[PDB]
Amino acid sequence: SVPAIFLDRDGTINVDHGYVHEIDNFEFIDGVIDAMRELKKMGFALVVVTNQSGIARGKFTEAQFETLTEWMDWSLADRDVDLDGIYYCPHHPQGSVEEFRQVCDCRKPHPGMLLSARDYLHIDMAASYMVGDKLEDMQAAVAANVGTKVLVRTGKPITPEAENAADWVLNSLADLPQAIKKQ
């Protein structure tokens, strides 16, 4: 039963520019790739869990997302970061694109993507971590019983509510390996 770092994408791995869906607009946050490779060496499985309502909004297609995500996966793999899972949610109750127009339980703060990852990779949840920049991330983590909930300051400016719900607040994902290592 392996421990994991569940990872928000926009604002945590890549600078949030708003509905990022193009390679030219994807900017890794400083030091996160190195930090992810270290996390891995410390024996954590790494699992991306990202809301992509942009798809239900019509801003871009599930297939452009697929294209970006494949590129992202390779860029990481080529840097010795091998992601154990990539989960996403294309939905929004008010979506303008029918096939993604719906309520769901994968859309954080619903824990859908975390539990699914739990089942499919057999993750020790109480020994796992959630890293994101929003309240919905802390709430999603809480529901799924993720032991350690980590807010970061690299994305959405943090709300006091997001901070209420988090266990740690770090400047960045780049800081996580250190934070963990000192217990």
Ligand SMILES: O=P(O)(O)OC[C@H](O)[C@H]1O[C@@H](OP(=O)(O)O)[C@@H](O)[C@@H](O)[C@@H]1O
């Ligand atoms: O789950 P992660 O953060 O990786 O992806 C989701 C994003 O943060 C997106 O949230 C969106 O709105 P929401 O869906 O909250 O109504 C937007 O603010 C996008 O520009 C933003 O990047």
Ligand SMILES: [Mg+2]
């Ligand atoms: Mg985010």
Ligand code: NA
């Ligand atoms: Na949105």
Ligand SMILES: [Zn+2]
């Ligand atoms: Zn969903």
